[PDB]
Every structure is written in C-alpha cells, then in structure tokens.
Design a protein around this motif. Sequence first.
Motif, mmCIF file in Angstrom:
data_model
loop_
_atom_site.group_PDB
_atom_site.id
_atom_site.type_symbol
_atom_site.label_atom_id
_atom_site.label_comp_id
_atom_site.label_asym_id
_atom_site.label_seq_id
_atom_site.Cartn_x
_atom_site.Cartn_y
_atom_site.Cartn_z
ATOM 1 N N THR A 159 -54.408 17.130 7.023
ATOM 2 C CA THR A 159 -54.490 18.283 7.915
ATOM 3 C C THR A 159 -55.892 18.468 8.451
ATOM 4 O OG1 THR A 159 -52.952 19.355 6.385
ATOM 5 C CG2 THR A 159 -53.742 20.681 8.298
ATOM 6 N N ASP A 197 -44.341 14.742 6.535
ATOM 7 C CA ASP A 197 -44.163 16.065 5.937
ATOM 8 C C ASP A 197 -45.396 16.935 6.204
ATOM 9 O OD1 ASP A 197 -41.567 15.329 4.839
ATOM 10 O OD2 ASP A 197 -42.630 14.151 3.323
ATOM 11 N N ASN A 198 -45.740 17.144 7.481
ATOM 12 C CA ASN A 198 -46.959 17.864 7.841
ATOM 13 C C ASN A 198 -46.923 18.622 9.191
ATOM 14 O OD1 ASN A 198 -49.736 18.545 8.502
ATOM 15 N ND2 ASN A 198 -50.277 17.198 6.808
ATOM 16 N N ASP A 199 -46.312 19.792 9.130
ATOM 17 C CA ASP A 199 -46.040 20.591 10.307
ATOM 18 C C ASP A 199 -47.276 20.874 11.082
ATOM 19 O OD1 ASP A 199 -43.304 20.876 9.609
ATOM 20 O OD2 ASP A 199 -43.920 22.393 8.128
ATOM 21 N N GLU A 200 -48.387 20.928 10.356
ATOM 22 C CA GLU A 200 -49.643 21.344 10.929
ATOM 23 C C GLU A 200 -50.053 20.243 11.866
ATOM 24 O OE1 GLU A 200 -49.024 21.680 7.539
ATOM 25 O OE2 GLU A 200 -49.005 23.878 7.460
ATOM 26 N N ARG A 202 -47.928 17.812 12.965
ATOM 27 C CA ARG A 202 -46.861 17.726 13.979
ATOM 28 C C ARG A 202 -47.082 18.722 15.138
ATOM 29 N NH1 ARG A 202 -42.124 18.039 9.443
ATOM 30 N NH2 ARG A 202 -42.172 15.891 8.681
ATOM 31 N N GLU A 203 -47.547 19.941 14.850
ATOM 32 C CA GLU A 203 -47.759 20.910 15.921
ATOM 33 C C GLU A 203 -48.957 20.484 16.722
ATOM 34 O OE1 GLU A 203 -46.022 23.707 16.906
ATOM 35 O OE2 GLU A 203 -47.485 24.761 18.170
ATOM 36 N N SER A 244 -40.449 12.351 13.023
ATOM 37 C CA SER A 244 -41.238 13.272 12.226
ATOM 38 C C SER A 244 -41.624 14.524 13.047
ATOM 39 C CB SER A 244 -42.474 12.549 11.703
ATOM 40 O OG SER A 244 -43.166 13.338 10.756
ATOM 41 N N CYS A 245 -42.058 14.323 14.290
ATOM 42 C CA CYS A 245 -42.433 15.459 15.132
ATOM 43 C C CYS A 245 -41.260 16.385 15.426
ATOM 44 C CB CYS A 245 -43.043 14.985 16.438
ATOM 45 S SG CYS A 245 -44.700 14.323 16.165
ATOM 46 N N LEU A 248 -39.950 19.626 13.503
ATOM 47 C CA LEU A 248 -40.471 20.922 13.822
ATOM 48 C C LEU A 248 -39.778 21.510 15.066
ATOM 49 C CD1 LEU A 248 -42.962 22.571 12.593
ATOM 50 C CD2 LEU A 248 -44.203 21.828 14.662
ATOM 51 N N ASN A 251 -41.145 21.181 18.672
ATOM 52 C CA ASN A 251 -41.289 19.944 19.424
ATOM 53 C C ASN A 251 -40.017 19.563 20.191
ATOM 54 O OD1 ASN A 251 -44.026 19.184 19.161
ATOM 55 N ND2 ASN A 251 -43.684 18.420 17.059
ATOM 56 N N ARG A 469 -33.995 25.644 5.428
ATOM 57 C CA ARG A 469 -34.607 26.869 5.939
ATOM 58 C C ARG A 469 -34.389 28.147 5.082
ATOM 59 N NH1 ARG A 469 -34.783 26.457 11.166
ATOM 60 N NH2 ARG A 469 -32.534 26.029 11.205
#
Length: 488
Positions: A159, A197-200, A202-203, A244-245, A248, A251, A469
């Motif tokens: 990150t 596994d890294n939304d941060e 991915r965003e 992966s993207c 989220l 995306n 979720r």
Amino acid sequence: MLDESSVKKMILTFEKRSYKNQELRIKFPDNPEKFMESELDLNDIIQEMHVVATMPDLYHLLVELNAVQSLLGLLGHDNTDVSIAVVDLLQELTDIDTLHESEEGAEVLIDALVDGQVVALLVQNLERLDESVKEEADGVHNTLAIVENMAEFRPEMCTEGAQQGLLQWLLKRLKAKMPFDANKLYCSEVLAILLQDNDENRELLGELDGIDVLLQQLSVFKRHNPSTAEEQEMMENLFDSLCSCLMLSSNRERFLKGEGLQLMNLMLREKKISRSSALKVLDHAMIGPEGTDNCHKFVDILGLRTIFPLFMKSPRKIKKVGTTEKEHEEHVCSILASLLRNLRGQQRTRLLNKFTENDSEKVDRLMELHFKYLGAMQVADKKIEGEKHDMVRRGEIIDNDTEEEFYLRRLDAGLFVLQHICYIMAEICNANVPQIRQRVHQILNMRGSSIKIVRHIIKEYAENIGDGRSPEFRENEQKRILGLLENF
C-alpha cells in the motif's frame, strides 16, 4: 568465511568511501578527475559487500553503523553506475531465501528500509535510468526484483509503496510505446502482486486511469495470438491484474466507460487464446449488485448471442488451452446467475427468451448440467459420510481442520457451479412462464431427482451467501433468495 569484526571493518570502509565521495563530488563538481577514483572504490566496496548477505545474522550491523541510510542516499547519486551497484546489493541483501534464515536480521532491515522510504527512492532511480542502455535495463529488472522480495516477506508495505510513486511508474511502463521486453513482463508480474487482495491499490489504479492501460494493452491480443510464451504470460498477468481490480465495486464503472465489455466480447467471438480469460473477466464484471449496469450493457451489445453458445457446448480446445471443462462451465453459469439476478426490463425479457427458444432447449441443458454436478456432489458427500464413519471407528475426533478438508472436497466436486445452477433454475421458474416450469418438473420428477433436493441446495446457498459483504447485505440476499422458493 569471514567474522563479525572482519565485517564491521568492511562496512566502516564503505561509510569511509561513501562519505569521502559525497564530499569530493560536492567540492569539485566540474572535474571528474578529482573524484572519479573515490567512486571506483565505493563501487568496488559496494560490490564486495554482497558477501554480507551470506550471513543474515549480522544485519543489525548495517543499520547500527548507519550503512542502510547512506546506501539510500546512494540511490540518488548523480551517476547510474553507483546507483545500480546499490540496487545490486539491495537485491542480494533482500533475497527471500536469505531473509528466512534469521528472523532478527530480516526484521530489523526491512524496518530500516521502510523508515528510509525505499520504494520512493528506488522509483526516483527508475525515473532516470534508460532501458536503451543494457546495464540500466538490468537495473530496472533488479529494482523490480527488490519490491517483489519485499512484498513476499511483508505485504502490508505494498500500500505505502504503490502510493510512493511505483504504481504510476508501472502503468506508464506498460503503456510506453516500446517493443515487448523482459522488463515489460516483469512489470506485469509486479503490478498484479501489488493488487493482490488490496483495495487501496486497486482504487489507486482506478484514479490513475489504470484500467484504460490494462484495456489497451490487453486489446493487442483481441484478433491475433501472442508470439512467445513470455509475451503470453504477460497477457495472463494483465488479466489477473484486471480481474483483481474488478473485485472493487468502484472499478466496474471505470471498466464499462473503457469499453471493456465490448473488448472481452470481441475476444469471445474471435476464439483466440484470450477467450478463457476474457470469459473470467466478464464474470468478474457482472457478479453482484455492482454488476448491474454492466449486465445491462452486456445484453445491449449482444452478449447473449455470445454466451449461450458457450452454455450449450463447452469448447473443443480444452485439451490444449489449460482451462478445464469444469472451470468453463463454472463461469458461464456464474454469468447467467448474475444476469438473472440483476437484469430488469427489456434485457431481462431477452434473457428469458433464451430459455423458451426452441422447445426450451436451454432448459434441457441446464438440467443436463444439474444432474452432472448433483451426481458428483452425491459421491463427494457419500465419501465424506464414509470417512466420518471410519473416523469414529478409529477414535478420531472430527474438528474444524477436518471440516475444512471436507469443504474443499465439495468445492472440487462442483459445489459452487451446482449452487449457481439451482439458483438459475429457481429464478427461471419464477418468471411466470408455464412452459419453463413444466419442463423443469417434467424433467425433475420422472428421473432420480426432486424439487426437495433442489430446495435444499438453495437453502445451503442462501445460508452461506454474501460471505464477502456486510452484515445487512447477507440478511437481505438470504431473504430475496429464500423468496424464490415460494413459487418453486
């Protein structure tokens, strides 16, 4: 071998020369002659220092004597030869095999490097190297070796690293109009790790217009095949990154605007090597509520005419390609399941029409698949009962670890696809189309299966649903799904 004291000296020499060189560089800026020797030494000793990596036990020595902090100052040195020799050393020092040897040594150094903000310092270094010069292209390769080494030992820094300018560099490197290249392949590999596994990240990819990048680069393989196994392994890494993207919800919108659906569609139509992955992407693009707009667009652009053929027959190429029948069947049903979940209006109708043409042939198929997987589940479960019986005979308490082995066996037998199939049946039977209910019950009751068995599979599905979720979500879905049983 050499000893702690023979090492402490070598480092103290480095610092000696590091310092000396910095001074002479500042004091005689015009005249290479006055400082050059100082450099060659720093280079030599920096190289000699590699041997420190042999004994990772003595890693406090490099932090304690301030060797790590100056060594980063060196990544910014005005001559690439020094900078790259530093990278060389950082690669050897940081090699995972080594970092597992002594916990203490590993642990202390990583902390020193994070403190240093190494990823931002390596990136400034990349921005100045020129891949046209072979020794500098290897420098790119080696810096990329490092981030990989560091992420393998300690993911949480990814990150920070990404934000520290790395992700942007990668995106620009994948875009760049340069012939395909081992560094390109490596960029692709490194990028996909950053997102795992890294939304941060991915965003952040989203905000940087990453998705466009992935789609242009992937669009190279829409009609033509890739030349080489390296260039094919890149393509696959791009897809990996892309999926992966799409994990989220944010995306999915960026994919759509990037004419992502059209591309993956076109890929399916041209039946090249991209087809297996393109199917996977489509799946990811449509999966839950955040799929909704994408589902609708899929139909708009005629996705229905592309997917159903693949629902009817699973591709010939299966012995050659690597994607198995099971996998392929897994995604199609996934996709249909999302279409049935999220479609409304005209598009829904068009979907339901596919189940009526011609004498509900798709219903037959659906039910063909039902039995195939149901059957496999029944064997899997029978085997599991047996094993539990045998555990009790032998006195072995069953525990969560056992349960997890059992779950996995069901997963391997086709549990997910089975769940999807049944969801589809049920949704299909709640479209108030008598023709379709009839066929299901017709088919279902005459043979060895029953409404009761299906109803049961749905419940299990509901129960364990929305594991992803939020607590309120899990409640709401479970409700909706269980509602499908009222007219079925």
